[PDB]
Amino acid sequence: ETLGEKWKKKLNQLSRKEFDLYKKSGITEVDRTEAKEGLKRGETTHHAVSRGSAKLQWFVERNMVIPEGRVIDLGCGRGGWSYYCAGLKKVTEVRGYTKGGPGHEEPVPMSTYGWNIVKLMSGKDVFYLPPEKCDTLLCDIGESSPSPTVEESRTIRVLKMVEPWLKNNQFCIKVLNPYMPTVIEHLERLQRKHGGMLVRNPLSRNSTHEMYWISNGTGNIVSSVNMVSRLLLNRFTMTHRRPTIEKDVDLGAGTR
């Protein structure tokens, strides 16, 4: 039994009250007040449609992924990763696909900087999409479940699905459950072939062990996974630490 599995078991024991306090304890979060108010008013400029724009920006501004040319955004949701990439100098085209429909977010149309180079498509299950040529491959798919074996199956499926899209390009792929031994085996094989490294984003909630496989980096996958498991385990030991608050991103306005 891995450290991650011990973390999961403890998470599933928490009451809703304990869970809600644990999930943001000591994390970093952007202040969404202004964006939520603007989006409720139907404002289409400046606001990021979700917390996702700030989350991908954290990797981008650390050069862990450097979006360029044709960007494919798998599981785009409302479009936060897509609208963020739309304003980056090196990006020329953004194609987002998302499931939508009941239980899934629909793309939100925006007029933030570079909106005219974005195409978001709903009603698209990426597990049936044939791969397309692209310069940047992003994937943020991985639905949490109280069952780690269900999460293991979901994580492996994402990893098998993204590989044919990987052709010496920039990438940032969510790994929902990176601690299960079978997932580790796939991550190690994929890293030997495609390089990159698994990174924990400080904007992720403690209620998920998610890590991101990013193209520009090296390191030991097992060590990075066990470091996260120990961090999350130590976060149950103390009383709620209020999250570190940062400014949300301003995605501006205008065509390009």
If binding is defined by CB under 6 A, does position 39 make contact with ligand SFG? Answer: no
If binding is defined by CB under 6 A, does position 178 make contact with ligand SFG? Answer: no
If binding is defined by CB under 6 A, does position 47 make contact with ligand SFG? Answer: no
Query: Distance between terminal CA atoms of the chain?
Result: 52
If binding is defined by CB under 6 A, does position 98 make contact with ligand SFG? Answer: yes
Annotated binding site for S-adenosyl-L-methionine: 50, 80-81, 98-99, 125-126, 212
Give the one residue of 46, 78, 186, 209 binding ligand SFG; rule: CB under 6 A: 78
If binding is defined by CB under 6 A, does position 50 make contact with ligand SFG? Answer: yes
Give the one residue of 22, 58, 59, 81 binding ligand SFG; rule: CB under 6 A: 81
Number of amino acids touching ligand SFG (CB under 6 A) = 22
Q: According to CB under 6 A, which residues from 135 to 164 bind ligand SFG?
A: 140-141
| CA–CA gap between residue 4 and residue 7 (Å, rounded) | 5
| 3 vs 176 by CB, closer to ligand SFG | 176
Give the one residue of 75, 107, 114, 178 binding ligand SFG; rule: CB under 6 A: 75
| CA–CA gap between residue 152 and residue 214 (Å, rounded) | 19
Give the one residue of 65, 95, 105, 196 binding ligand SFG; rule: CB under 6 A: 105
| Site stretch for ligand SFG (CB under 6 A), options 3-11, 99-107, 181-189, 239-247 | 99-107
If binding is defined by CB under 6 A, does position 52 make contact with ligand SFG? Answer: yes
Q: Shortest Cβ contact with ligand SFG: which residue?
A: 52
- Residue 194: which of 174, 222, 213, 220 has the closest Cα? 213
- CA 193 to chain CA centroid, Å, is 22
